[PDB]
Amino acid sequence: MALVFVYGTLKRGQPNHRVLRDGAHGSAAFRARGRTLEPYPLVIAGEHNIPWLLHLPGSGRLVEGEVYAVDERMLRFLDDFESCPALYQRTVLRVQLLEEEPPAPTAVQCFVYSRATFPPEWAQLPHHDSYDSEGPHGLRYNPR
């Protein structure tokens, strides 16, 4: 299967998690708790307080998230859920698995939804290692 690393509103406990569990969309199975190997800026921006993984690897913070195994139906759904390619783009990155001889692999390549073109000042907004709509910043996700 394809693997998707989710860092935002699709995570367990977050406002859009349900779309992964709606079987009309295909299938998504939790595989691992993960953390990016490379840092990225993850910022809450815009009137809706959406989380954006800015495509600036090498800056920001290591980002916490969840790895899901998805079928082709669910990948096509999620591409459209994320308004690709105009808003987000589906890119790849390597994720560290968070859990003897030979030792277990500790990395896996995943797809992720990142954003390449954005207001430049967004890069100076607070950087998040773990997004939560209900987190300490107070900027609750606002789709309305």
Q: Which CATH number goes with the domain that contains 42?
A: 3.10.490.10
Please, is 114 exposed, middle or buried when counting C-beta atoms within 10 Å of its C-beta (0-12, 13-18, 19+)?
buried
DSSP 40: B
Distance, CA of 104 to CA of 49 (rounded, Å)? 38
- Are 5 and 33 in contact by the 8 Å Cβ rule? The answer is no
Determination approach: X-ray
Distance between alpha carbon 68 and the CA centroid of its chain, in Å?
11
| Catalytic-residue membership of 82 | yes
SS3 assignment, position 20: helix
Per annotation, catalytic residue among 72, 82, 121, 134: 82
Would you state the structure tokens that stand for residue 67, as one six-digit string? 């790895």
DSSP 66: E
Distance, CA of 37 to CA of 58 (rounded, Å)? 10
- The resolution, in angstroms to one decimal, equals 1.2
Number of domains comprising the chain: 1
Distance, CA of 130 to CA of 144 (rounded, Å)? 23
Q: How far is CA 106 from CA 32, 33, 34, 77, 109, in A?
A: 11, 11, 10, 29, 11
Helix-strand-coil percent breakdown of the chain, rounded to 5? 15, 35, 50
Residue type, 30: F
- Are 18 and 136 in contact by the 8 Å Cβ rule? The answer is no
Q: Annotated binding residues for substrate, as ranges? A: 7-10
> Which residues make beta-bridge pairs with 34?
65, 97
Q: Annotated binding residues, as ranges? A: 7-10
**Domain interval for residue 105:** 1-144
Residue type, 45: A
